[PDB]
Design a protein around this ligand. Structure first.
Ligand code: CLA
Ligand code: CLA
Ligand code: CLA
Ligand code: CLA
Ligand code: CLA
Ligand code: CLA
Ligand code: CLA
Ligand code: CLA
Ligand code: CLA
Ligand SMILES: CC1=C(/C=C/C(C)=C/C=C/C(C)=C/C=C/C=C(C)/C=C/C=C(C)/C=C/C2=C(C)CCCC2(C)C)C(C)(C)CCC1
Ligand code: SF4
Ligand SMILES: [Ca+2]
Ligand SMILES: [Ca+2]
Lengths: 73, 31, 139, 40, 154, 80, 154, 139, 40
C-alpha cells in the first residue's frame, strides 16, 4: 500500500530477511525501501502486476493466498 | 493496513490441510 | 485339530483380547445346511458358511449363548454344535455337550456330582464346624 | 534481526525449523529409507 | 475393495479393527519407529530418547503456570517441579518392572524382561533429568538464545 | 551383469577372445565361416564392459557387441 | 631380522603392512585399550568414555573463536554450539546403527550389533553432553578454578 | 583343498581388503621350473617358488593379468596356471581355463552361449518391444 | 600462588598434571599390568 501511494520512487519489497548470520552493517544495508526490518527489493514485476489488475490492499492479497491454499488442497 | 497475528496463525492452520493432502498424494504416487 | 471355515465377518472390537493368546479362548463348531446370518454375541451380525463353521470367542458363556441362538432362532434347528476350550499351548479340550447328549436329557454313565443326600434345612450349624475351614454345605 | 510485521516470533522459530529441523529430519528419514535391506 | 476398515491382522474375531488410525502405513512406520518400538534398539537407548522428550516438555507447565511464575525464580521452580515429577515417574517405572517380570523371562522383546525394563528405566531417568535441565538452561538464558537467533551478538 | 552377444558375421579369428582380459569369451565349433568357429560368451557375469573384444573385431560392423546393463561388484571392477 | 616393516599379521597378500605406526606393541596396547576396543567393556561404557572426551574437547572452538567470543555470553555460546553438535553426532551415530545392523546379528563383537551400537550411541550422548557441561562449568567459574589452583581461598 | 606354496613377498598395501573375507577372493596356482621374480598385479615384485605356487588376489582380472604375464613374459612359458574363486564359506569354484583348454582354441563340448542367429543390423526396433522389459538384443 | 617468571601458567597446569594425572594414570596402568592373567 505504501508502494500504491507512490509507485515511481518507492522500491517494491519481496519479503523480510530473517538471517541470524547478518552483522550490523548488513542489517543497516538491507533495511531499505522504507522498511524497519531487513528486506529484499522485488524485481519480478510483482507490484506492477498487482497494481495493473486493481489490487490495492494487503487484506485482498491474504484472502487470495488462503484461496490458493484451498485450491491447492 | 497490516495483517494480524491471528490472521497469520489461521493461515498456517489452513496450510495444515494441503500439507496432509500432499502427504496423501505423494504416498499414493509412491506405490 | 479343530476344523471348520470361519464365518465371514467384517471384524469387531468386541472379539478376542490378550486373554485369548495368554490364558484361554473358546471355540464353537457347527454344521449349517445353508448360508444365513446370525448375531454375534460380541455385537453385530456375521454370516455362517454352508457346511462346517468354526468360531473363536472369549468366554464359554458367549459360545453357549450362540448355541442357544442356534437351537432356538433358526427354523432348521442347529443341534450339533460342539464347544471347546483352547489353550495357548495348543491343547483343545472338548466341553459341550460333554457326553454327546444335551444335559437337559438324562443319560446313563453320568455320575451324580454336587448331589446331597440331606435336605436343604438339615445342614448342620456353623458353630459345630468352627476352625475347620469348611462351610455347612461342604460337609 | 527483528520485524515490524505481525507474529514476528514466527521467523524466530521457523528459520531454525526449516533450516535445521526439517532438513536433518528429512535426510535422516531418507538415509534410513535408501539403505533399507527390506525386500528390494 | 475400497473399504479402508478391515479386520485387524486379517482376523475378524480379534477385538480390534484395521483402521487408518490404527493400522495405516504411516501409523505402523511411525509407532514402530518410536524408541519404545524401534527395531534393534537397546532398552537403555529407548528409555534415553523417551526420557529426553518427556523431561524436555515437562519443564513447561510449572514454568508458565506454577506458584513461582510471578517471582524471579520462575524457571527454577519449573525445573524443580519437572525434576521431582521425573523422579516419581522413574520410581514408578522401576517398581512396575520389578513387579511385572518376577518369573520367567521371555525370548521375544528384550524390553519386556526385568533386565530390559531396568535398562529402560535407567535410560528414562537419565534422559528425563537431562531434558529438564537442557530446557531449563535454554529458558534461563533465553535472552542469549534470542540474541543468537536474531544475530544480535554477531 | 553386462550382455555380450555374438552375431553371425563372426569369422572365427579368435581376436576378441585373445583381447578379453576377464575370460568372458571362448571359441566353440561352427559351420558359418571358413575357420569353422564362432565366439561365445558363457562368462558374462565376469564381464566388466571394457569393449576390448569390440576393438579387436575385424568384421565391419563388429560381430561381437557389448551392452552395458546391470552393474555389480565384478562388473564395476571393484577390488573392495 | 632388523626389518621393522613386515607383513600385516603374517600375510603378505592382505593389503596392509606391519609398521611401527600400524602394528607396534605400543600401538596395539593403546588402540586396543581405547574404549572402542577395550576388552570386556559393555558398549554403553565405551560410548560413555568416548562421549566424555569428545564433548569435553568440543567446547573449545566456539568458546574461543565463535561469534559470541567477544560478548558476555562467550562460554554460553561455546556450550550451546557443543551441545548442538553432540546432538547431531548422536543422531548420526544412531541412524548409522539402525542402517548397518538391519539383518542378522554377529556372534563376535557385541559393539557391532544393533543392540550394542544403540547402547554405544546412548553412552555417547550421555557422555557428550556431560563432558560439554563439565567443561562449561569449569570455564564459567574459571576464576574459582584459578583461585583453587593458586590457593587463593586457602 | 587348494595347494601350493605362497610366493615370498614383503607385503604391500595393494593386496586384499575386507571384500576378500566378506564377499570373495581369487586364487591362482601355477607350477614353476625355477625360482624367478614376477611382477605383482597389485604393484611391486614377488618371487615365485620352485614347484607349486598359490597366490591370493582381490579380482579375477588381477589373476588373469598375472596369467597373461606368466604366458608371455617368461622364456619357459608357464601355461598350466589355474584360477579359482574362493568364497568365505570355504567353497572353491574353478574358473580358468574352464574346460582345461585355453579359450582361444576350440574344444568340443563347448556350448555356444551369447550367440545370435541374426545379424547386427536385423535387431528389431525398440518401439516394437515397448513395456516388455527387454532390450532389442535380448529378443 | 603466582610467579614473576616466564610462562607462569605452566606451574598452574603442570602441578596438578604431575601430582594427579601422571600418578593416577601410572598406578592405573601398573595395576592393570601387575594383575594381567595373560600367560605368565
Ligand atoms: C555462511 C553463509 C550463509 C548462510 C548459511 C546463510 C543462511 C541464510 N540466509 Mg543468507 N546471506 C549470506 C550468507 C549466508 N546466509 C551473505 C554473505 C549474504 C549477503 C549479505 C546473505 C544475504 C541473505 C539475504 C538477502 C537473505 C538470506 C537468507 C538466508 C536464510 C535462508 C533460509 C531459507 O529460506 O531456507 C533454507 C534454504 C533454502 C530453502 C534454499 C534452498 C537451496 C537448496 C540448495 C535446495 C536443495 C533442494 C534439494 C532437492 C535437497 C533436498 C532437500 C532436503 C530437505 C533434503 C538462511 C538463514 C534469506 C532469509 O532471511 O530468509 C527468509 C534472505 O532473504 N541471506
Ligand atoms: C512455496 C511458496 C513459498 C515460499 C518460497 C516461501 C518462502 C519463505 N517463507 Mg513462507 N509461507 C508460504 C509459502 C512460501 N514461503 C505459505 C503458503 C505460508 C502460509 C500462509 C507461509 C508462511 C510463512 C511463515 C509464517 C513464515 C514464512 C517464512 C518464509 C521464509 C523462510 C522459510 C520458512 O521458514 O518457511 C516457513 C514456512 C511455513 C511454515 C509454511 C509452509 C509453506 C508452504 C505452505 C509449503 C510450500 C511447499 C512447496 C510448495 C512444496 C514444493 C517445494 C519444492 C522444493 C519441491 C522464506 C522467504 C518465514 C519468514 O517470514 O521469514 C522471514 C516465516 O516465519 N512463511
Ligand atoms: C539456513 C539455516 C541456518 C541457520 C538458521 C543458521 C544459524 C546459525 N549459524 Mg549457520 N550455517 C548454515 C545454515 C544455517 N545457520 C549452513 C548451511 C552453513 C555452512 C555449510 C553454516 C555454517 C555456519 C558456521 C560455520 C557457524 C554457523 C553458526 C551459526 C549461528 C550463529 C550464532 C550462534 O552462536 O549459534 C549458537 C546456536 C546454535 C549452534 C544452535 C542452537 C540450537 C538450540 C538452542 C540448542 C539445542 C536445543 C535443544 C537441545 C533441541 C531442541 C529440541 C526440539 C525443541 C527441536 C546461528 C544460529 C556459528 C555457530 O554454530 O556458532 C555456535 C558458526 O560457527 N553457521
Ligand atoms: C501446560 C502446557 C504447557 C505449557 C505451559 C508449556 C510451556 C512451554 N513450552 Mg511446552 N509442550 C507441552 C505443554 C506445555 N508447554 C506439550 C504437551 C508438549 C508436547 C510433548 C510441549 C513441547 C514443547 C517443546 C518441544 C518446546 C516447548 C517449549 C515451551 C516453552 C516455550 C515458551 C518460551 O519461553 O519460549 C522459549 C522458546 C525456546 C527456548 C525455543 C528455542 C528454539 C528451540 C531450541 C527449538 C529450535 C529447533 C532447532 C532445530 C534445535 C536445534 C538442535 C538440532 C536439532 C540441530 C514454555 C515454557 C520450548 C522450550 O521449553 O524451550 C526450552 C520447546 O522447545 N514445549
Ligand atoms: C537406604 C537405602 C536406599 C537408598 C539411599 C535409596 C536411594 C534411592 N533410590 Mg532406592 N530402594 C531401596 C533402598 C534405597 N534407595 C530399596 C530397599 C528398594 C527396594 C524396594 C529401592 C527401590 C527403588 C526404586 C524402584 C527406585 C529407587 C530410586 C532411588 C533414588 C531416588 C531417590 C529416592 O528414592 O529417595 C531417597 C530414598 C531414601 C532416603 C530412602 C529409600 C529407602 C526405601 C526402602 C526405598 C523404598 C522404595 C521406593 C519404591 C523408592 C522410593 C521412591 C521415591 C520417589 C521416594 C535414590 C538414589 C529410584 C531411582 O532413580 O533409581 C535409579 C527408583 O526408580 N529405589
Ligand atoms: C579449535 C581448536 C581448539 C580451541 C580453540 C580450544 C580451546 C580450549 N580448549 Mg581445547 N582441545 C582441542 C581443540 C581446541 N581447544 C583439541 C583438538 C583437543 C584434543 C581432543 C583439546 C583438548 C582439550 C582439553 C583436554 C582441555 C582443553 C581446554 C580448552 C580451553 C582452555 C583455555 C582456557 O580457558 O583455559 C582454562 C583451563 C582449564 C579450565 C584447565 C583446568 C585444569 C583441567 C581441569 C585439567 C587438570 C588436570 C587434573 C588432573 C584433573 C583432575 C581430575 C582427576 C583426573 C584427578 C579452551 C576453551 C581445557 C578446558 O576446556 O577446560 C575446561 C582442557 O582441560 N582442550
Ligand atoms: C514425535 C516423535 C518423536 C520425537 C518427539 C522425537 C524426539 C527425539 N529424537 Mg527421535 N525419532 C522418531 C520420532 C521422534 N523423536 C522416529 C519416528 C525416528 C525413526 C526415524 C527417530 C529417530 C531418532 C534417532 C535416530 C535419534 C533420535 C533422537 C531424538 C532426540 C533428539 C532431538 C530431536 O531429534 O529433535 C526433536 C525431534 C522432533 C521435534 C521430531 C522428530 C520426529 C522425526 C520423525 C525424527 C526423524 C529422525 C531423525 C533422524 C532424528 C532427528 C535428528 C535431529 C538432529 C533433528 C529427541 C528426544 C536422537 C537422540 O538423542 O536419541 C537418544 C537420535 O539419535 N530420534
Ligand atoms: C630431573 C630433574 C628435574 C626435577 C627434579 C624437576 C622438578 C620440578 N619441576 Mg621441572 N623440568 C625439568 C627437570 C626437572 N624438574 C626439565 C629438564 C624441564 C624442561 C626444560 C623442566 C620443566 C619444568 C616446567 C615447565 C615446570 C617444572 C616444574 C617443576 C616442579 C614441579 C614438578 C612438575 O610439574 O614437573 C613438570 C616437569 C615437566 C613437564 C618436564 C619434565 C621434566 C624432565 C624432562 C623429566 C625428568 C624425568 C626423570 C629424570 C626420570 C627419573 C625420575 C626418577 C623418579 C626415576 C619441580 C620442582 C613446574 C614448576 O616450575 O613448578 C613451580 C613447571 O611448571 N619443570
Ligand atoms: C602433590 C599434588 C597435590 C596437589 C596439587 C593438591 C591440590 C589440592 N588439594 Mg591435596 N593432597 C595431596 C596432593 C595434592 N593436592 C596429597 C598427596 C594428600 C594427602 C595424602 C592431599 C590431601 C588433601 C586434602 C585432605 C584435601 C586436599 C585439597 C586440595 C585442594 C584445595 C583447593 C580445593 O578446594 O580444590 C578443589 C579442586 C579439586 C579437588 C580438584 C579440581 C580438579 C578439576 C578442576 C575437576 C575435574 C576436571 C575434569 C572433570 C577433569 C579434566 C580432564 C582432563 C582435562 C585431565 C588443592 C587443589 C582439599 C580438597 O580436595 O578440596 C576439595 C582437601 O580437602 N588435599
Ligand atoms: C505436532 C506433531 C507431532 C508431535 C510432535 C511432538 C510431540 C514433538 C515434541 C518434541 C519434543 C518433546 C522434543 C524434545 C526434545 C528433547 C531433547 C532435545 C532433549 C535433550 C536432552 C539433553 C540435551 C540432555 C543432555 C544432558 C545430559 C544427558 C546430562 C548432562 C547435561 C545435559 C542436561 C545437557 C507428531 C510428529 C507426533 C505428528 C505430527 C505433528
Ligand atoms: S567388454 Fe571387456 S570383459 Fe567384457 S567380453 Fe569384452 S573384452 Fe571381455
Ligand atoms: Ca506466586
Ligand atoms: Ca560477535
Amino acid at each position: 500500500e505504501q508502494w500504491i501511494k507512490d509507485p515511481l520512487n518507492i522500491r517494491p519489497i519481496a519479503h523480510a530477511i530473517w538471517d541470524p548470520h547478518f552483522g550490523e552493517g548488513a542489517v543497516n544495508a538491507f533495511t531499505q525501501a522504507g522498511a524497519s526490518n531487513p528486506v529484499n527489493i522485488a524485481y519480478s514485476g510483482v507490484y506492477h502486476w498487482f497494481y495493473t489488475i486493481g489490487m490495492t490492499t494487503n487484506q485482498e492479497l491474504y484472502s487470495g493466498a488462503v484461496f490458493l491454499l484451498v485450491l491447492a488442497s | 493496513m497490516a495483517l494480524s497475528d491471528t490472521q497469520i496463525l489461521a493461515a498456517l492452520v489452513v496450510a495444515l490441510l494441503p500439507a496432509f493432502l500432499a502427504f496423501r498424494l505423494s504416498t499414493e504416487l509412491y506405490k | 485339530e479343530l476344523s471348520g471355515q470361519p464365518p465371514k465377518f467384517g471384524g469387531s472390537t468386541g472379539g478376542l483380547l490378550s486373554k485369548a493368546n495368554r490364558e484361554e479362548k473358546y471355540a464353537i463348531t457347527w454344521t449349517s445346511a445353508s448360508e444365513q446370518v446370525f448375531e454375534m454375541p460380541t455385537g453385530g451380525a456375521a454370516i455362517m458358511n454352508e457346511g462346517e463353521n468354526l468360531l473363536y470367542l472369549a468366554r464359554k458363556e458367549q459360545c453357549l449363548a450362540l448355541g442357544t441362538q442356534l437351537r432356538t432362532k433358526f427354523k432348521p434347528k442347529i443341534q450339533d454344535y460342539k464347544i471347546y476350550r483352547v489353550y495357548p499351548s495348543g491343547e483343545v479340550q472338548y466341553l459341550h455337550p460333554a457326553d454327546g447328549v444335551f444335559p437337559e436329557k438324562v443319560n446313563e454313565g453320568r455320575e451324580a456330582q454336587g448331589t446331597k443326600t440331606r435336605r436343604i434345612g438339615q445342614n448342620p450349624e456353623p458353630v459345630t464346624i468352627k476352625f475347620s475351614g469348611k462351610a455347612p454345605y461342604e460337609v | 534481526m527483528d520485524g515490524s510485521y505481525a507474529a514476528s516470533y514466527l521467523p524466530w522459530i521457523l528459520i531454525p525449523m526449516v533450516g535445521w529441523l526439517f532438513p536433518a529430519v528429512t535426510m535422516g528419514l531418507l538415509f534410513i529409507h535408501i539403505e533399507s535391506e527390506g525386500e528390494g | 475393495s475400497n473399504q479402508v476398515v478391515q479386520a485387524y491382522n486379517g482376523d475378524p474375531f480379534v477385538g480390534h479393527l484395521s483402521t487408518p488410525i490404527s493400522d495405516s502405513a504411516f501409523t505402523r512406520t511411525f509407532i514402530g519407529n518410536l524408541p519404545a518400538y524401534r527395531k534393534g534398539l537397546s532398552p537403555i537407548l529407548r528409555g534415553l530418547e523417551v526420557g529426553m522428550a518427556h523431561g524436555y516438555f515437562l519443564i513447561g507447565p510449572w514454568t508458565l503456570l506454577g506458584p513461582l511464575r510471578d517471582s524471579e525464580y520462575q524457571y527454577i521452580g519449573g525445573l524443580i517441579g519437572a525434576l521431582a515429577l521425573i523422579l516419581v515417574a522413574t520410581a514408578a517405572l522401576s517398581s512396575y518392572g520389578l513387579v511385572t517380570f518376577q518369573g520367567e523371562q521371555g525370548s521375544g522383546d528384550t524390553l519386556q524382561t526385568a533386565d530390559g525394563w531396568s535398562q529402560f528405566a535407567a535410560g528414562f531417568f537419565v534422559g528425563g533429568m537431562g531434558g529438564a535441565f537442557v530446557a531449563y538452561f535454554l529458558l534461563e538464558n533465553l535472552s542469549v538464545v534470542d540474541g543468537i537467533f536474531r544475530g544480535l551478538f554477531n | 551383469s553386462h550382455s555380450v552377444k555374438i552375431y553371425d558375421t563372426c569369422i572365427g579369428c579368435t581376436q576378441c577372445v585373445r583381447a578379453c582380459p576377464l575370460d568372458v569369451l571362448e571359441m566353440v565349433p561352427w559351420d558359418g565361416c571358413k575357420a569353422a568357429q564362432i565366439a561365445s560368451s558363457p562368462r558374462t557375469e565376469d564381464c566388466v564392459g571394457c569393449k576390448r573384444c569390440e576393438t579387436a573385431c575385424p568384421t565391419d560392423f563388429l560381430s561381437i557387441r557389448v551392452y552395458l546393463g546391470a552393474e555389480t561388484t565384478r562388473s564395476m571392477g571393484l577390488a573392495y
